Amino acid sequence: ALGKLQDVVNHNAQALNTLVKQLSSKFGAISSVLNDIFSRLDPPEAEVQ
Amino acid sequence: FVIRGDEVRQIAPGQTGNIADYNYKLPDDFTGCVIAWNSNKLDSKVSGN
């Protein structure tokens, strides 16, 4: 019966979860950890990453 | 100044080594030009400089 009210909560929670999950993507870079990128490479192309 | 041939590559922003760390350090956001040429005919002694 209350699917209309349940859908709003489900949508918001799923969108927030997707936003959180998007944080752990390399996004075309070598690694997804910023501080690893800093420590493992020199500033020249670390800036690009 | 005058440096060794192998260490000429250390004169660049973000580099590490003996010369870059303990003798002459360049800023990360450096702008300008560096000119290096061999001078074996003027700074070499048979006995040793």
mmCIF file with all atom_site columns, N, CA and C in Angstrom, chain A residues 42-44 47, chain B residues 13-15 28:
data_model
loop_
_atom_site.group_PDB
_atom_site.id
_atom_site.type_symbol
_atom_site.label_atom_id
_atom_site.label_alt_id
_atom_site.label_comp_id
_atom_site.label_asym_id
_atom_site.label_entity_id
_atom_site.label_seq_id
_atom_site.pdbx_PDB_ins_code
_atom_site.Cartn_x
_atom_site.Cartn_y
_atom_site.Cartn_z
_atom_site.occupancy
_atom_site.B_iso_or_equiv
_atom_site.pdbx_formal_charge
_atom_site.auth_seq_id
_atom_site.auth_comp_id
_atom_site.auth_asym_id
_atom_site.auth_atom_id
_atom_site.pdbx_PDB_model_num
ATOM 1  N N  . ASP A 1 42 ? 56.412 12.195 -8.678  1.00 0.00 ? 42 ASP A N  1
ATOM 2  C CA . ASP A 1 42 ? 56.884 13.566 -8.597  1.00 0.00 ? 42 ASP A CA 1
ATOM 3  C C  . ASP A 1 42 ? 55.752 14.540 -8.914  1.00 0.00 ? 42 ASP A C  1
ATOM 4  N N  . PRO A 1 43 ? 55.864 15.784 -8.453  1.00 0.00 ? 43 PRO A N  1
ATOM 5  C CA . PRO A 1 43 ? 54.779 16.767 -8.638  1.00 0.00 ? 43 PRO A CA 1
ATOM 6  C C  . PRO A 1 43 ? 54.376 16.977 -10.092 1.00 0.00 ? 43 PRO A C  1
ATOM 7  N N  . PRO A 1 44 ? 55.334 17.003 -11.078 1.00 0.00 ? 44 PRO A N  1
ATOM 8  C CA . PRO A 1 44 ? 54.942 17.319 -12.465 1.00 0.00 ? 44 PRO A CA 1
ATOM 9  C C  . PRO A 1 44 ? 53.677 16.645 -12.986 1.00 0.00 ? 44 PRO A C  1
ATOM 10 N N  . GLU A 1 47 ? 50.361 16.445 -10.505 1.00 0.00 ? 47 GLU A N  1
ATOM 11 C CA . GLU A 1 47 ? 49.396 17.520 -10.702 1.00 0.00 ? 47 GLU A CA 1
ATOM 12 C C  . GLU A 1 47 ? 48.355 17.137 -11.749 1.00 0.00 ? 47 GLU A C  1
ATOM 13 N N  . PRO B 2 13 ? 62.462 21.209 -11.173 1.00 0.00 ? 13 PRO B N  1
ATOM 14 C CA . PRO B 2 13 ? 61.497 21.247 -10.068 1.00 0.00 ? 13 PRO B CA 1
ATOM 15 C C  . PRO B 2 13 ? 61.027 19.851 -9.689  1.00 0.00 ? 13 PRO B C  1
ATOM 16 N N  . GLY B 2 14 ? 60.908 19.619 -8.383  1.00 0.00 ? 14 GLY B N  1
ATOM 17 C CA . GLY B 2 14 ? 60.389 18.371 -7.868  1.00 0.00 ? 14 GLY B CA 1
ATOM 18 C C  . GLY B 2 14 ? 61.371 17.222 -7.828  1.00 0.00 ? 14 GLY B C  1
ATOM 19 N N  . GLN B 2 15 ? 62.591 17.408 -8.320  1.00 0.00 ? 15 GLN B N  1
ATOM 20 C CA . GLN B 2 15 ? 63.566 16.330 -8.323  1.00 0.00 ? 15 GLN B CA 1
ATOM 21 C C  . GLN B 2 15 ? 64.139 16.116 -6.926  1.00 0.00 ? 15 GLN B C  1
ATOM 22 N N  . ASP B 2 28 ? 58.661 24.332 -6.689  1.00 0.00 ? 28 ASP B N  1
ATOM 23 C CA . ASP B 2 28 ? 57.810 23.476 -7.509  1.00 0.00 ? 28 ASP B CA 1
ATOM 24 C C  . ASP B 2 28 ? 57.261 24.228 -8.716  1.00 0.00 ? 28 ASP B C  1
#
